[PDB]
Amino acid sequence: MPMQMFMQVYDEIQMFLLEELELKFDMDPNRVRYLRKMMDTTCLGGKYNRGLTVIDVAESLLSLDDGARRKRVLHDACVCGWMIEFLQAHYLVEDDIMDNSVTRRGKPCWYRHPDVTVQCAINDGLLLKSWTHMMAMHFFADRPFLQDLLCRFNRVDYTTAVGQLYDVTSMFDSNKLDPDVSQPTTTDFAEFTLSNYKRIVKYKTAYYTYLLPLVMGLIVSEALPTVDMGVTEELAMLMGEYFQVQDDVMDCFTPPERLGKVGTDIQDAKCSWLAVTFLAKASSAQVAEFKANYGSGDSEKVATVRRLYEEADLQGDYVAYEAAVAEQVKELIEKLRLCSPGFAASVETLWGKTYKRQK
Amino acid sequence: MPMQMFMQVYDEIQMFLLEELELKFDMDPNRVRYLRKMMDTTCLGGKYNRGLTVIDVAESLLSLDGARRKRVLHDACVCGWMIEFLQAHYLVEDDIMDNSVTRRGKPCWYRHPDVTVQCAINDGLLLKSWTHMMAMHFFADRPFLQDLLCRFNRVDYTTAVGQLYDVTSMFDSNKLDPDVSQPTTTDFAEFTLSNYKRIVKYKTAYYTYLLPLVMGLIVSEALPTVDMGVTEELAMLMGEYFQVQDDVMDCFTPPERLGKVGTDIQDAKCSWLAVTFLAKASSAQVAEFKANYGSGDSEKVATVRRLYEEADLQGDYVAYEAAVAEQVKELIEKLRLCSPGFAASVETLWGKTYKRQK
Ligand SMILES: CCCCOc1ccc[n+](CC(P(=O)(O)O)P(=O)(O)O)c1
Ligand SMILES: CCCCOc1ccc[n+](CC(P(=O)(O)O)P(=O)(O)O)c1
Ligand SMILES: [Mg+2]
Numbered sequence: 001m002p003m004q005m006f007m008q009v010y011d012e013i014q015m016f017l018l019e020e021l022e023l024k025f026d027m028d029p030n031r032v033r034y035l036r037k038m039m040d041t042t043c044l045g046g047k048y049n050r051g052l053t054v055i056d057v058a059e060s061l062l063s064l065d066d067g068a069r070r071k072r073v074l075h076d077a078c079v080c081g082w083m084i085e086f087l088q089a090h091y092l093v094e095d096d097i098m099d100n101s102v103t104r105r106g107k108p109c110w111y112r113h114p115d116v117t118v119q120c121a122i123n124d125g126l127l128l129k130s131w132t133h134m135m136a137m138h139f140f141a142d143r144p145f146l147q148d149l150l151c152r153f154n155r156v157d158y159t160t161a162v163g164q165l166y167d168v169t170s171m172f173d174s175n176k177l178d179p180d181v182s183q184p185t186t187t188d189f190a191e192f193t194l195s196n197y198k199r200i201v202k203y204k205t206a207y208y209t210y211l212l213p214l215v216m217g218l219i220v221s222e223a224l225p226t227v228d229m230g231v232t233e234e235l236a237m238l239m240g241e242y243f244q245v246q247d248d249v250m251d252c253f254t255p256p257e258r259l260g261k262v263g264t265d266i267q268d269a270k271c272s273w274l275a276v277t278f279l280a281k282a283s284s285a286q287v288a289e290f291k292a293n294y295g296s297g298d299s300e301k302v303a304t305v306r307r308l309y310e311e312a313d314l315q316g317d318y319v320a321y322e323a324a325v326a327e328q329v330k331e332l333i334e335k336l337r338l339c340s341p342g343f344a345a346s347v348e349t350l351w352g353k354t355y356k357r358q359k
Numbered sequence: 360m361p362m363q364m365f366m367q368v369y370d371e372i373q374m375f376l377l378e379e380l381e382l383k384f385d386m387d388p389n390r391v392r393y394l395r396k397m398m399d400t401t402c403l404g405g406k407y408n409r410g411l412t413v414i415d416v417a418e419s420l421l422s423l424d425g426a427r428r429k430r431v432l433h434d435a436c437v438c439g440w441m442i443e444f445l446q447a448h449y450l451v452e453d454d455i456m457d458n459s460v461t462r463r464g465k466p467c468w469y470r471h472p473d474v475t476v477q478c479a480i481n482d483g484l485l486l487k488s489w490t491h492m493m494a495m496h497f498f499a500d501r502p503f504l505q506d507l508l509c510r511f512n513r514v515d516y517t518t519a520v521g522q523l524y525d526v527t528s529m530f531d532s533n534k535l536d537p538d539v540s541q542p543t544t545t546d547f548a549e550f551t552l553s554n555y556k557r558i559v560k561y562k563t564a565y566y567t568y569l570l571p572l573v574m575g576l577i578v579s580e581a582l583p584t585v586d587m588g589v590t591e592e593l594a595m596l597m598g599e600y601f602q603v604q605d606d607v608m609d610c611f612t613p614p615e616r617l618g619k620v621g622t623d624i625q626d627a628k629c630s631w632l633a634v635t636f637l638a639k640a641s642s643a644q645v646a647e648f649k650a651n652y653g654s655g656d657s658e659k660v661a662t663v664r665r666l667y668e669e670a671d672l673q674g675d676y677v678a679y680e681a682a683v684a685e686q687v688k689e690l691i692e693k694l695r696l697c698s699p700g701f702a703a704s705v706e707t708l709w710g711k712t713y714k715r716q717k
């Protein structure tokens with residue numbers, strides 16, 4: 001049922017976008033055809049956690065009628081859902097390029113498709129982002145909440161690109177960060193700290209993945225101030241950090257077939273949860289062998305890093321991590337429940353889709 | 360004068376953005392420094408015609424206290440920087456898409472020794488996001504914010520649509536299929552003036568000509584006073600001519616004057632020169648073009664250039680330029696009737712465009 005509606009609104013949105021292109025942007029059938037495939041490939045095939053969370057929060061805050069309100073709020077919630085899913089699609093298109101990934105959701109990355117050049121793919125990503133603004137303006141033209149909705153969406157979007165900068169520069173000595181001078185990947189790994197890890201993940205993931213679906217659900221249902229926002233943000237940040245930790249762990253240990261995408265973290269010398277957690281507790285010997293093997297495409301070097309992780313009991317650390325998180329989450333959810341029972345339930349439901357995801 | 364204050368608002372915007380990053384986004388001094396340099400390198404060193412136009416339109420319209428003049432002109436500077444940052448964003452990504460080497464006498468952003476191509480794509484995105492951040496900050500309390508951001512975003516989308524038209528213009532559109540690789544076009548049957556005019560209207564005309572005019576009008580609280588049909592006609596015309604000029608210069612202007620290395624021939628681009636040549640060429644000439652276009656090879660590039668010079672493209676260009684100046688004049692007069700001050704600012708814009716040696 002939630003999926004049923006969400007996919008009707010996908011049709012509505014696509015229809016509005018591609019037709020507008022044909023009618024007002026002189027677009028030929030072939031390019032409308034290209035863009036329809038692009039849109040389907042890039043936006044569809046995920047679990048839609050972000051999109052569906054907007055619907056669920058809206059519905060939960062509805063009680064605060066001929067049903068006309070319900071029709072309206074839930075349809076606005078579906079559109080906001082797609083705004084975040086299209087924002088996500090944009091990020092993944094560009095991120096697969098930045099990360100030199102090969103596949104995504106069991107398909108080749110968009111930029112890796114035979115008839116998609118890297119240059120078009122960059123622009124297709126840009127198109128994805130612009131469609132978020134185009135759909136909002138079409139559907140929310142007459143809504144009092146439009147300006148606030150767009151202000152917040154835009155803030156989070158900026159936040160996410162700021163986090164991406166943290167991610168993409170995390171393997172380079174920041175003191176030597178300088179446009180005019182080339183610099184290799186870090187050799188001492190001095191900045192692969194848990195502190196620098198939490199900052200990357202808070203900004204690149206937590207805001208758009210957890211805070212924004214919640215905020216949008218609250219905006220469309222006109223209930224944003226009914227909620228302790230300090231507690232709501234604590235929750236989003238924590239759940240968002242945990243989600244990315246899971247993403248990192250899965251990159252290394254989850255078989256590609258379940259994962260859908262091949263893991264690039266070790267080869268990209270990424271500042272992952274695994275690397276920072278290993279380096280903090282490792283012996284000098286272990287640090288040496290890590291440094292000898294990280295950040296190379298070589299297959300046995302990557303298999304050494306995996307053994308080192310297993311030998312250092314990182315799966316054990318993860319279990320302990322997960323348990324600390326779940327306890328914090330539970331405590332914050334009850335704090336929410338006191339004056340926002342409906343919302344706390346939608347947050348519980350979001351947690352259900354996150355906690356111990358086999359994904 | 361307009362230049363001095365425009366640069367004063369730049370420092371104000373820069374200080375707001377970088378300070379916000381340190382205070383609210385947990386940014387370290389090292390990355391702030393990288394971002395300051397990025398912002399300077401990508402946003403400064405051009406002519407600022409887009410930005411300066413907003414100020415000039417704003418000033419031309421403040422009749423049709425003195426704190427209002429200070430506020431309207433400050434608002435016009437911020438809008439100017441919005442379009443300049445939007446442009447910076449475009450040029451960062453465009454240089455990557457186009458495989459360009461220099462821009463404004465320096466390496467393109469993504470060619471800087473300490474800029475990875477991956478970071479460059481993202482820096483481009485930061486550039487776009489800064490347009491929104493600056494508007495939200497300076498115009499928070501301004502009744503025109505929603506309308507401003509709506510038109511801004513629409514022009515932004517229009518431009519990315521034109522970029523698609525540009526980047527897919529050398530591929531047979533009948534065989535556009537994500538699942539199947541295709542080489543560049545070999546018959547060039549889609550290199551038409553028609554197809555050319557569409558690329559150019561969308562990729563350049565809207566953000567380069569219409570957006571600065573619109574923004575100047577918005578901050579002047581004077582948008583409904585002008586004929587928008589006529590204003591758009593001018594913008595599209597002025598915008599097409601500007602791009603034609605950009606195309607010609609790519610091929611015939613010494614890099615030193617331009618600041619950049621021409622990639623149009625190499626990238627098999629649907630340039631004004633290409634479509635204009637192909638439309639008038641003999642079959643023998645078309646053949647020579649076909650064997651020489653879209654290749655990095657030095658001598659093939661210089662074959663294409665000679666083919667252009669021999670086909671009197673420079674006469675075609677003079678004639679087109681004349682026809683444009685003719686259509687432009689008439690539209691400005693029509694605009695001058697009900698909107699005298701706006702027409703003047705449009706005429707000043709045309710002055711910065713007509714026969715530019717840029
Ligand atoms: C312009 C902002 C782009 C933000 O991109 C992101 C943010 C968060 C997550 N991802 C995709 C992740 P994925 O590639 O799916 O493993 P990762 O590259 O972070 O591991 C991409
Ligand atoms: C996402 C939209 C990107 C638009 O990029 C553009 C649009 C218009 C002009 N330019 C730069 C031009 P330039 O590279 O300066 O000669 P060109 O690449 O069109 O020849 C770049
Ligand atoms: Mg990735």
Ligand SMILES: [Mg+2]
Pocket residue numbers: 095098099167
């Ligand atoms: Mg990434």
Ligand SMILES: [Mg+2]
Pocket residue numbers: 247248251
């Ligand atoms: Mg990952």
Ligand SMILES: [Mg+2]
Pocket residue numbers: 453454457459
């Ligand atoms: Mg270019």
Ligand SMILES: [Mg+2]
Pocket residue numbers: 453456457525
């Ligand atoms: Mg280009």
Ligand SMILES: [Mg+2]
Pocket residue numbers: 605606609
């Ligand atoms: Mg050019």
